[PDB]
Every structure is written in C-alpha cells, then in structure tokens.
Amino acid sequence: VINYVEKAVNKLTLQMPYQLFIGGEFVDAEGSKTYNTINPTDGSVICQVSLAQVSDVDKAVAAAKEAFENGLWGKINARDRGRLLYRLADVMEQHQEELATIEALDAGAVYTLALKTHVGMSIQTFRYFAGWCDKIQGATIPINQARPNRNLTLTKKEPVGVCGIVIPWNYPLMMLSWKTAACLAAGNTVVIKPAQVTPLTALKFAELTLKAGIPKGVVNILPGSGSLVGQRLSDHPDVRKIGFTGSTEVGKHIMKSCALSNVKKVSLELGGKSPLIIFADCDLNKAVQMGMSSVFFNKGENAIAAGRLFVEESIHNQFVQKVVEEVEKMKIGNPLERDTNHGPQNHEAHLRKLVEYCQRGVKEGATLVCGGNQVPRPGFFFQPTVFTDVEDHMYIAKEESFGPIMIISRFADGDVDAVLSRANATEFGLASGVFTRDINKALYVSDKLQAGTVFINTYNKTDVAAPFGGFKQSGFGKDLGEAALNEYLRIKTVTFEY
Amino acid sequence: VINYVEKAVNKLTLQMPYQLFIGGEFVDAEGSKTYNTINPTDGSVICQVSLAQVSDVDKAVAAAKEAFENGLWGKINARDRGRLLYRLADVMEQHQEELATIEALDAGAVYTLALKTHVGMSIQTFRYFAGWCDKIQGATIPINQARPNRNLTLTKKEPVGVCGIVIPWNYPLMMLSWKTAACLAAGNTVVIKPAQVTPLTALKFAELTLKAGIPKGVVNILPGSGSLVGQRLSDHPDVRKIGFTGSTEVGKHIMKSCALSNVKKVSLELGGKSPLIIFADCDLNKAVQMGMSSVFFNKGENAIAAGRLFVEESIHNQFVQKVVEEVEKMKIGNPLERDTNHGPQNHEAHLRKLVEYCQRGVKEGATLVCGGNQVPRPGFFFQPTVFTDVEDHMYIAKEESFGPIMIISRFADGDVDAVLSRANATEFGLASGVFTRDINKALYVSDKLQAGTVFINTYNKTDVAAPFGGFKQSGFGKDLGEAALNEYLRIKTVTFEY
Amino acid sequence: VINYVEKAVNKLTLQMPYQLFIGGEFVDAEGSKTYNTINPTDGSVICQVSLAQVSDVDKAVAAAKEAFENGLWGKINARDRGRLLYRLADVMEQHQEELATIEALDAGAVYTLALKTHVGMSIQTFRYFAGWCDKIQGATIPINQARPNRNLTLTKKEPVGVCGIVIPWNYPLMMLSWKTAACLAAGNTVVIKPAQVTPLTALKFAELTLKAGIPKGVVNILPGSGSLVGQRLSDHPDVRKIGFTGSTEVGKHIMKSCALSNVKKVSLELGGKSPLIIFADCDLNKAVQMGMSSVFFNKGENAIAAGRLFVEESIHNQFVQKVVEEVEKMKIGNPLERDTNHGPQNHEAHLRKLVEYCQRGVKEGATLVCGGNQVPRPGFFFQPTVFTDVEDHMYIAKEESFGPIMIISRFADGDVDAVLSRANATEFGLASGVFTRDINKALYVSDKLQAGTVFINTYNKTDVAAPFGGFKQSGFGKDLGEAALNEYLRIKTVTFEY
Amino acid sequence: VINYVEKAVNKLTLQMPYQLFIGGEFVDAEGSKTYNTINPTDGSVICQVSLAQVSDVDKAVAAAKEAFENGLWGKINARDRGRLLYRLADVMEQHQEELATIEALDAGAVYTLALKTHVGMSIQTFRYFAGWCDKIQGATIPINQARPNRNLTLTKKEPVGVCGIVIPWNYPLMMLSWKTAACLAAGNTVVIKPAQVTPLTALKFAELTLKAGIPKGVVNILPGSGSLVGQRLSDHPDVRKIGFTGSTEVGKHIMKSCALSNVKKVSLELGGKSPLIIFADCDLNKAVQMGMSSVFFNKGENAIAAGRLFVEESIHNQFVQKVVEEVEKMKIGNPLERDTNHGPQNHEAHLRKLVEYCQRGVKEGATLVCGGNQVPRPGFFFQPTVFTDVEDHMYIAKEESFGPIMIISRFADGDVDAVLSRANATEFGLASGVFTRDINKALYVSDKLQAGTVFINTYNKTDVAAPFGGFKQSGFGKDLGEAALNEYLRIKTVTFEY
C-alpha cells in the first residue's frame, strides 16, 4: 500500500503520492526531509513532498543500473517492451481526468487544456514511441572485401543504459513524457528529476508505471533541486546519458558536468526567442487568432512561444487593434473553472520575473498597450500583455519572457530579407513562424529562418511524430519523432571476415 | 606563387607548403612565429612551420563564416558540391605518392602502408562522402490534422555552419580526411587544427583544395597548439560544431569548452583499451597473424589497437611461441625502405612514454617476453613488445599504450562470460575483437562486448562506409558511414496548415 | 443481429458467422447459394457457407471503393487508423481461444499450436502494423536548383486504394492477417477471398472488425472459388492492387489477369522447394529437432517447409536413426486434444495428393524409411514420412509436397559448393536453411543460397518484423516487416519552384 | 577494331557503331540482317543497322548470365562497381558533343537541348547511381527471441540478376541511362532493346562501356523489333526482371509475358494524359512560358507533357492570346542549327499520327487556334498547335498525342474541386501540374491530383534524385531516385539462432 495525499476537488478524489519513487516503491528521502509544493491559484501549500538527497540519487541510479543489467527490462523482446509502454499509455488514459486535475493544482494548467495537451499529448507520446520498439533497426553495409576472403558488416542499435532526465515546470507531465517515452522505447532505464516546484504528476505517473507492470527500477523519480539532485545525476559515474530541457545557462552547466565526469551523452532543449513574421497578404483574422495563441498558449509558459511578432507596416495598426479586442475577451481565473482561459503563472519566483521583465520593457521605451502587471487577486496571476514600438536593441527584443507578453515590431512593406535578418539576429533558434498566403514567400522564409521548427500559417502545432529541438544556443538533439530515438541509442558496428 | 619547402626524396621533388592556410591563401602567422617539425626517422628538423596565434584563429573562422554565408559553397547544388569533393579525391590520387612520402617524413608512416592506408583510405573517404551530398534526405511525416484544416509536416536537412576540427598525429592526413570529408559533404565550412607535431600533409592537402577548385575559405588549416589554437576554436562564438579526435582528458576539456561558450555541438573520438578475445577453436596461425596486426599496425599508433589479448589457456603458450617467432621476423627501419615492417614512433615524447610504460609493466609483475625498449639507432624507434602473465589489476591492463605493445592474459578453458566480464571491465569502449570458428560464441560475444566496433575473425578492418566511434569514455558520435553525416547536419521541421 | 452457427466444443460455445461480409454487414450470396465446409478430423460437414458470385464481388468492391473515397477510413489521422488496428488486435486477443478452436475445426490446426501461431502471430501482425501507420514517411530531396529560382522536392506516401487479397488454406487466419494488416495500415480498403475450403476464421475475423469499430466497407470478405471470385477481383477495373499467396501456376494467371485488365499492382508469394543443408559439424540432436520441425510443423502445410534435406555423409545414418526414434514419439490425433502433436491434413483432395506423391517416390526408387500412408482412422490424417536415398532427378526431389514428408539426400564430406549447386537447382527460392557450428560455412552458405529467407541453426523462425518473400518462381514482394508496406503504398513526387 | 559509320557533321566527326553489341563485341545479327535508320530532318537514310534475331537475344542473355555468375562484375566490391560507373559517366561527358549530335540525327533532338538534357541528364544519372553502389544497405531487425536462445535477423540487398530493358524513342539515350544506371548500380547485368527507330546513341553508349572498362557481357544491346527481340526478352527463362517504358497496351503485353514465362519482376512506365491547372492568381507571363514548355518541350515527345491545360475563366482568353504570340516566335528547323528551338518529330509514322490526331480534334468540334499541319519543308516537322473549346468527352481530351499540341479547357472562377475531378477523370496518372501563388490552393491541389508527379509553379522539372513513375494505367515502379534501386534489388532475410 502507498501513502497518498487525498483531495476532493473537481468532482474527483485525487490520490497523490508524495514520496521518492525508487526501485519500484515510494520511500521517504534521507532523514525524512520534505518541502512544500505551492498551488499557484491561491498561494497555498498543496502538500509536503519528499526532498531527495545525494544518497537518494545514488540509490535511484543503483536501482536503474540493476534493472537494466539484470532485471526483466533488459531481457524482454523489443516487441514486449512496446506492449508495456502501450499499456502504460492506456493506464494514463484511464487516469486522464485525475492527472489533468493534479496538473491544474500543481502548475496552474487550465483543466480543459491540461486534459487535451499536458495529459492528452503525454498519452499520444507513449503510444507513439511504443510503436517504435520493434521497428528500431540497424544496417548491413557493403564494405570492401579482404580478398580472397569475404566480409560482412552490420550495425546493431543498442540502448545507452542508465539515463538521467532533468525537466522544467511548464508542462510537468508532458515534458516528462516526451523524454521518458523515447528513453524507455529505446530499452533504457531512467532516473527522472522533475522541476522542484512541480513534482505531483511525475509522482502520480510513477504510480501508474506500477499499474502498467513496468519492472521495478526501470523508472525512478526524484523530487528535489537541480543544484543537488540534478547535479549528482550529471556527475554520476553510472549514468551514461543526460536528457535536459530548461534554461540555456543551466544547459551549459549540465553539459560541462557531463564532460567533467565520464563524457556521458547529453541532449539540450534550451531557451527560445522565436520570431513570428506576419505579412500583409495573410488572412488577418486568422493571424490574430494564431498570433494570440502563439504568445498566450499555456499562459505563455511555452519554450516555442513567439517571442517577437514582426508585422508588416500596412496591417500593423489594424493587427494591434484586433489583438487588443481579443485580449479583452480573455477570462482570467481558477484553472478548474470551465470558462477560464488564462490561468495563473506557474510559481511566484516566475511571476516576479515577469513583473521585472515588463518594468524593463517600459523603462527602455517600448509602448505598453495593455497588461504588464500581476492581476490583483490571490495566487500568481499575470495580466496578458502587449508591447508595441519594440526596437531590435531592446532587452525585451532579445530576452525570453516565458510569460504572456506579446512583443510587436514593424517591418516595411515589401521588405523580406530585412525582416529575416532581424528575426535571425538572436543566439536562440528553437522555433519561428510565418503567416502569408504567398507560396513563394512562405517557402523562401522557411528556408531562411534559423530555427529548429518553422510554422507556416499556424503556430504551436507540435506533434509526437514531428521532431522538436533547437539550433545555436537553443541546444541540440530532438524530442519527438524518430529522431528522438537517436539520443537514447548507440550504434555498434560488427565486422566479420569469413 | 605559394612558398614551398622543397626536398628531393623517394624519387620525387616534394613541394611542401609550411604556412597557415586562411581564406584560400598561404600566409605567415601573427608576428611571423614558427616552430620546427621533426623527422622521427633521424630526429632532424624537416622545416619551420607557421605557428598560429589567436588572431589567426579569428581570421580563419571569419573566412569560414563568410564562405558559408555569402560564398559559392553555400549556393551551389548538393550535386555540384559532390562533384567538387569527387574532384578533390582525384587530385589527392594524382598526388598520392607525394602525400605518402610527406606522411613517411612527418609521421614515420611506413611508405608502402601510407600509400594504401594513410593516403589511400583518405581518397576513398572523399569519394564516399562525395556520393552522399545529393542523397542526404529529410522526411515527410503523417502528423495529426487540425481538422477541418490540413497539415503538411516535412523536415529539411541543413548544414550546421562553421565547424572546427581538431585531430591527432597518428594518421595525420587520414584523421583529417575522415572528419573533413563528412563535414564538407554536409555543406559546412571548416577550420582544421592538425596535431602540432604533424602539420605537413594537412598543409599539402590545403593546396590540393585549391587545385580542386574548392572555394576560398571553405577549408582553413592552422598548425599550432591545442591549448592555444584548439582552445580558441572551442571557445569561438561563430563556431557551431567541434569534431574532435584525441585523448579522453582533452576530450573532456573540449566538451566543457563547447558548453561554456555557445553550446556548440561536439563529437568525441577518444581513447581505447580494446580487448581481443582468442578462443582455442580459432585458426591459430591466422590468429597469430591478425593478433600481431591488431597490436603492431602503424607502430601501435592506432586508437582501436587491441590493448589486451585474452588467450584461451590451452592455446596460450603455443600462441606466444608463434608470436615471438613472427616478431623476430619483423624488419625495423626507415619508412622509405620497401621491406620495412615497423617504422619509428611518431615523435620523441611518445617514445619516452613508451619506455616508461614498459618499465612500469615489468615493475608491477608482468613478464616481458620481448622488446620493451628504444631500438638503438638514430630517430625514435621502439621494439615490438610482448607482455605475458598480465593480470586485471595491473596498470598495463588498464592504460592505453598507443604503441607496439602486445599485452596478453590467459582465460580459462570453456569459460565465456568470465572473460567477457574482464574484457568489459574498462571505461573505454572503442573497439574489440573475437577469434573463434564457433558461430555461437562469435554471435554471443559480439552482443556482449561493450564497444563501438566488434571485429570477428579479423582486426583493424575499418571501412569508409562502416561507422566508427566509441561508447563510455571512448566518446560519442561516428566518423565514417552514413551515421557520420548526422554530426554535421541539423534538422529543421517545417509545418504548414492549409 | 448476426446469424451464427453455434457449436459447443472445447469448453466453449463458438459463434460462427457463415455469410458474405459486405459493407459492414453479413449477407447471403446472390440466389442464397451455399457450399459445405468440411472438418478434417472426421470428414463431417461443419456448416453451410455463402458462395459469393460475380455480382457479390462487384458489391464488395463498390463498398470498398466508397469506404476509401468517401468514408471515414480515408479521412482519419494515420495515428487514429493505427488506434483502430490496435483495437482490432485487442479484440482478436479477447477472442483468441474461440478463433483457435474455429481454426482447429476448419483447418485441422492443432489447438495449442493455433493459439501460439495461427492466432497468436495474427494478433502480433495487427499490433506490429498498427505501429507503422503514423511512422510511414516520405522524403525531401536535394534536387538541382533552377537558378536564379529555387526548388523544393518532397515525396508523399499515399494508399494505393482498393485492394484484393487472395489467400490459401494452410493458415487461414494468419495468411489473411499478414496481408490485411499491412494493407490496412497503409490506409487501403480491401476485398478478401479466403480459400474456399477454409472460410470460417476469416468470417469470424470480419465480425471482429465490427466489434473493433473498423468503418463499414473497409474490410469485405467473400468465401468462394478462385476461378469465379478471385478471377473477378483480378479483372475488376476499380481494384488497383492484388496481394496473392498460393501456387506458382495460379500466381502466373493472377499476374496475367492484372496485366490484361488495368495493370493493377501485384505481389506474389508462391510455392517452395526449400533446401536445408546439415553439416557434420552441427549439433546433431538439435539438428534432428529442428530438421523434424522444418518438415512436420503444421502437418507440413507450410510454404517454407524444408522440401529437401541434404545431410553430410558421415552423420547421415545417425541422423536418420535419430529422426526415426523421434517420429515414433509423435502423437497423432484430434487437434483439440492437448496431447496431440500432429493433426489431420487440411482437406481430402490434399490428402489424396500426398498418398500419390509417396506412391511415386517409392516407384521412382527412393527408400521409404517410414510413413507414406493415410493413417487408419476417420478424417484426413497422414503418417509423418521419411524418404532417404533421394537422387536429384527424382520427382520428389523437384516437386513440392506441402505435407509432412522429409526428403533426404546425402552429400560427400567436405563438399560445400557441390551441395549448394544441388540446393539451388530449382526454379523455387522461397526459403532455405543450414545447420553448422562453423561460422565461415554458415556465412558463406547463406550468401550462396538462392532463397528469400535463409535460416541458420534454426528453422521456421518467421517474425512479424522480418520480411518474407521469394525469389525466382516463388514470386516477388514481401509480407511482414517494413518492406511489406511498399506493396500497399504509392509514392507521389511533388516539385515546387519558388 | 570496331566498324563505324563515319560522318562529318556539326564540327566534329561522328564514329557510329551500327552492329549488335554482345559479350563486349560488335557483331552482325543472324544472317547479317539489317534495317535502315532514318534522319527525321530530311527523311534520308543515316545508315544500315544490324537487325537482332531470336538467336541473337539468346546469345546476349547468355553473355549477361555469364558476366553476372562468373565474370568480374559479380566479384568486385560495390565501391569498385561505383568507380566503373563514375568512369562511364566521365567517358560519356568526354563524348558529350558526339552523343548529342548522334541524338540530333537519329531522333531529331535539338542539339542545344540534347547536350543539356538527352546527354547531360544521362551523364548525371550515371554519376548519381554510381554514388549509390556502396550505400545500398540492408537491415538488422529486433525480432522476438526464441528463449532461452537468441536470434539475429538481418537482410541483405542482392542483385536480381540478368535484366532486360526495353525502351521507347523519345529520348533514346536518356531512357536507356535512367534504367541502365539503376540496373548496373544494383549489381545486375543487362540486355537492352532500344526502340527500333532510334538505335544509334545506344550503340555509341555500348562502345563507351568498353572505354570505361565495364566487363564483357555486363551490357548487351540489341537493335530490333519489340515483337521479336522485346518479346523474347520477356519470355526468356534466364531473364529475371524486365524494365519497361512505353505505351500502356505494350506494357500490358509485357506484364502478361513476364507472368506466363517465369514470373520475372516487371516495372512499367506507361502513357500519360497529364493535366496542368492554371489559376487566375498565378504569374500569367510565367504561366505562358511554363505552359508552353509543358506541351512543346522536345517537340511534345515527352511522356509527362501536359496533355490537357485547364485555365481559369477570367484569364483564359488573355492566356490564349499570349500563347499564340509566343508560338509565332518559335524557330522551326534543323536541330543542329543554334537558333532552332523546335525540331522535327521523331519519325514519319508519328508525324502522320499527329496529323490525324488534329483532324479528329477539328472534326469533333474543338477550336483549332493555330498549327495542326505538317510544316512544308523536308523531314517530319509538325506545327506547334493550340486547341481551345476542348470538352471533357472529346477524343483529344482523353487520348495522349505525344506531340506539340496544347489542349485547352476553361473552368469556372473559384471552382477547385470541379476542375480536380475533371483533371483526375482518366486512367492515366503519370504527371500533373498547378500554377497558383496561393499556398493553400497549391498544397490542396497537389494532395488531390492523382498522379505520380505533381509540379507546382513549374513543369518538366525532373531530377536524377527525384523518383519518377505513374499511378493507375500509367504503370508502377520508379525510375530515378533511391526508389529506382528497389526494382533492381532483392531482399534476402537471414535469421540465426544462437
């Protein structure tokens, strides 16, 4: 039997585990240390959660190692590994309302969105990658023959072994799922560190692995801080790969730590300052709707959020006019209320940063059209924000807000290369977008944009089959798609002479 | 006119450039600094070579960046890029005797071997990767449709941009060729740092890129030190990828340097301590020939050299007898003598390391069966060496010699898993081999060996089409094969709604 | 409400549809015509089954065409098509005992074997291909650019459209599943003709498509004759692809009919006379076990069954002795009885053919070591048979028995190429096998065998992920694996200029 | 020493072989039979050409078989096969002017076009496929393991063996090259039947295979009739694959002949009635240029020629006015003259057919806007022709002309689905095209068009890397791209247990 924090809310009875998940059981951290997880709708403590220590990390890694080297996960058929991951997805589907509610409490995710995206996409992720298990294939290669003898060369795709996954707080379950699904589908075992501020759906997910029959030690979950738990994972001599999603500066440190220990492999999904270029020949009403969504989706807590909108001179003023109209219709409120469409920010420290971000925007001369402030109510709500007259030298033109802040610049009618240059003048390169009805402009702009994803007449259209990752200082490696598997596999070349 | 060091040798008049190669021109380093490159056959100075400074690195990177962004290389068809790389191979083949002679002089490479391997495989590498240019393909992906609308998702494979390549001294031209061919085939431009002790074939190669019509600035070559030139490449804000081959310790530092600058991509080909397991049911005389080659090839200066031979008890002593008989037949001498089997070690400091390595093996209790010291003669020759009674705890059982030192341990008759455990008990993982006539042992042992390459009934059988790279602390990423391309390409996902 | 033939057998109540399945409903054939399906255990009539006429084929094709062009199947996401096929697999697994019992009745498949293979592999087939749906991907291709303009070239994989599947009687459900799973995963719709003598699992499968929610018209099943129903499918102007498994002579006629109508695509899985070469250095007892299995599995009604065994001279007599010892232990009986090893042949005409086959073998001078005759008991049982002293000119050396008849020839000790020549001297090339502990022989022999599958130290080891198809007159195209999809897809190239 | 027909023309000396090419030597046909090849510029006889008989086919097939089974071609490394084909491409380039001049003489190809396309693309084809040789790769597949044992499954890509290639006359050398390059790159040997009316570049190409060092027997060339030589290739028991390009009716017969002999593999590139849909939002001047090119390229003797132009109501008359203006500017004349941009039709029978075809268009009520007649000069020149008021039921709306005949229909403004239906109402499906600046219409139309190639804002843009083939009665299988290799390879599955 497992200890839960029980909570009657959203017409359900939530049963939330709150302990470390190690070697297939929920256990207290070393010394029974704990910390509070905060509900962002009202600032209250949801419950106490175990706080992993170094010795807990070592225990998690040991369990992962044993499960890989000697446990059932390392022995079963790829096909049957796949069956287990499908079953895991089914179990997650059976708990989708409960998971979405926990995500609503823990991260302020609007329930209807959490159900469709945070949770729904997590389910798709496990089903998608389950299908890959018995379709991961190596090669036979026609090398030169050592005459009078013959040669056969083949490759085998093998798991990398024990992995660490370190994720952020914006979509707690979904970021976990993206990376964990690829990791497990490739035959690895894993120690996962959720963002300290959002441990709850991870811990519930841990319980669901038990229900699905995932062998003990294959999935291990350690709520705790990056500087302690995350750091130890990156240092550990038995971890052979880190999968990381978070800020560029922590990414740099993680990669450094991978190097200095045992050259463990690393993938990095880092920040974004993603440009959206809106031409006069677009469908303007659709540009407003998709433009809205590109910034405000998931309260702007979205690595690929459009961080600059460049709007062609002749439609700029009309675009801003319509954006303001639509911004005014947004209902701000409790994520559990069905009419809510803008929930609170994830946690307090992030709310503070958003306040400062907008102060600086105003200080440096941008026009604040609306918002920019904490909403006066309990919790950590932030008013949807629109800036105009944003110039390329400005802080808010360079730096990622990760909040609901639309940052608008003009470009002259008929300029294409000039706006492209401005769009590309960033060390980020995670995503980008273009709205235009012109085929030639769409294709040309998408060649020239220096970003891992280019959206054309849409935005935020991610898919579990479509690889997702950055260029330049947005990192390297893919989540999602066939390409994701490559971060979690190694290639062995086997060459015979006969 | 290019300045040459001219040398009448080996029936040829070598014309050897000696300066930095930047933006299509041979130029002195800052302050006209130079250093000596040393002939390992007699310890004489071959000539002075420009010694790149930081400002020279910055110039080379600036030339590479301009060549990629605005030069011809970034505009031509993939197919036409292929034609240029094929033509480069042709030029290399037209100069193959000269390149092999230069390699004999600079690296102590035995001339017959240098023709066939150092130079011959370099030519194969360019031809092979030339064929890939117009066959690098992205995907179209059946994502979920945003009904009532439609979606098209495709991927585009793009170059990474400016690359730095840092290589070692054991096969100067060939290591350059492996990485550079893949790098250029993928459409990138490059700054190459050859090992300071072996700049000459790299500089001759630079001139050949001119004869081949490779556009100015696509290839830049900077002889100089790792800690100065190599460091600046890893730190440089406009370099987007480092391809590295060398020691594990420098590899760690390189990766750290990529992290701390701009999270540039990195691939690491690091040390080996590769195990060769020889069973009693093998063809013994063949095992002796291949066993010897697995150690002594290219005077042991070979990252995949078998660093331990595990020989089944019942054949051990006969195996050692035959090896000693064969070792006595090896002709040691000048790399230009056509009957030379064994040339000098690459440079003086390495010879001294090899003397110390062998003193240490004796001191810790291994049996010196033959060799173990510098051959008394001018230059830097080391005796082919055989150690027996080697035990798992010993320094020479753990550490990579990178010299012609056969390190033999028995294993028990009819044991398989126990020898595998010993073979795997290393943080290296670059290569390995197994000699056996038994199909079941061969397949099982190749599954279980923790190494990027497993040779079966052969050794050193690399091939331009067969991917080559390590596991664990031997690094990550592949040179050669289709797989090598992936270190030099990025994936852009382009998603339409219509 | 569906009409069933109800039968209480095997501790179950079977509910067997017996009508045509067209447009999602069970309906009588034109003029309510029927025929008898015969239980091979006792010769009794199981029930009457609808006998499809030309007008019924036309109705089924029309239903398939509507379902493809206007129905849901053609509109849903590839991912959701996948979900439906995974649901179909679950439904099949929920009914596995029932399906295996029906197959035991209809085909004489030993129940324990039918659970694991006839039905078990069918279930695996749908799960496997279900995973392919959203992972079938086109390409983006780096074509030459019409400078000063640009080009993008991509490929789209599209369904072929309406398909006909015509299958034999040896594994009724499994052969249907192999082809139908791939066909449907590629987004096609289908009309299936089971072998007239074995319609029952096909019809039950049809009902399971309803339970799984496969849209109406996607699957249509027509019990009936090849020369009427199969022929009309091949001739139909709206059918775009025929998938055929059966005899070489019918296969010729099918290909010819695809030609003369509308050059519909065709794939052909035809006969076999597969050689199994057993060397003296094999594991003898293992060779006996697998040798027997290679012939007797599924009462020899197995297209890849070893049709000749070549046994090295020095182990031949001992091999024959051991086979005879093991043959005597086989338990012949009712397929529903748990101790049964060897069930009845599929139908009477086939039994008659096997009797004649063995009469001819004795007549032409081969040594009948055992069997050769109908077992004295009700139904259509045939004694496991062993022939020795078979010479290459004999009829039984050339002709496919498709029954439990082991046909043994000797080869001289050491005579590798000579035995290969003998093994390849056939216009068939479906499968082949070699038993040897010698890696060099195994690799060499497998290069030289002219067959689509080579087994090494095993036999009948098929897998839903491993492609299966013949060379020469055994046909072309694959069932199973990624390769099977290509038969059911078309490639559209799309080339933009911008 | 080879016998040539020598001719001083176009500033060079042609040296044209005129005999059969068998087993690496030029030889007379049985009974020294010959026939005349006719120059379409003046109706004169170029020379006499050997006329292959049945026994010549058998000799060619036997040479091909021997070259495959025992000659060097079946023994050399894949890489070295690649070198030979790249050398063949070089030799072709060295003879580019001569080949293009022969093509002008024999087929009426305008010399400047022949140099760039007929010959230029042929050279690209061999270079492209040469690069594939050592990059053709099989798989290793994670099949279910027969516990407590292990399984390894790999696939080997092998040559099919002796192939027959039968080609049409519209681009003699280029059709030969497309198919032959893919065939040889895959390791096969081949017997080629050029169109009887166009043997000369094929025979010169045969001579170039000697200069390139292609082993004797690998390439064999048989000028002669389809009904005799082609038929025997389809029937031959030793031919294992036919590659065919030509009319639908002959394709049907070829496929039938493949079936009835030995189920040899077959690919079919058949007729087209390719629709080009021009929207009012296109760049009209560019649409006129590309539209004209879509019809008139290579005097309309082009399988992918737009056989039907649908032009949006509002631009229709202006489009027709502009086409007529541009047609008046075309220079009709000797293909060797540099100002010629419209050469003669390929042969006399085809000119007649075009004359009759246009009579029929006029008779059935289509408006003949210009052309329709033979040009009053020597040879077989036909006027660039434009029809308007073409109705869907008309013969000329349904039948492929294969000549320079633009066939125009209107469609209503804003119709999209209606025009698509009309464009898709054909049993052909080889190519298609759409001109529009609207991204949404372009993507949607290319989804809906039922053809193997869709051009968007261009036409005739084929590329050696882009697969080319038809849907429906336009056939199946690809020429060009990676996909083309699949017609010329077989997959062998090899499964070990250990």
Ligand SMILES: NC(=O)C1=CN([C@@H]2O[C@H](COP(=O)(O)OP(=O)(O)OC[C@H]3O[C@@H](n4cnc5c(N)ncnc54)[C@H](OP(=O)(O)O)[C@@H]3O)[C@@H](O)[C@H]2O)C=CC1
């Ligand atoms: N899809 C594609 O890639 C292409 C298709 N084509 C198509 O070809 C047609 C125009 O050429 P056309 O001359 O009419 O084509 P045909 O089908 O009449 O001839 C093509 C080739 O087939 C040969 N042939 C004829 N009968 C037989 C037979 N019984 N067995 C074997 N071979 C035979 C011909 O020989 P012979 O010399 O005696 O006539 C010729 O070499 C058009 O429909 C066009 O669309 C053309 C080019 C490319």
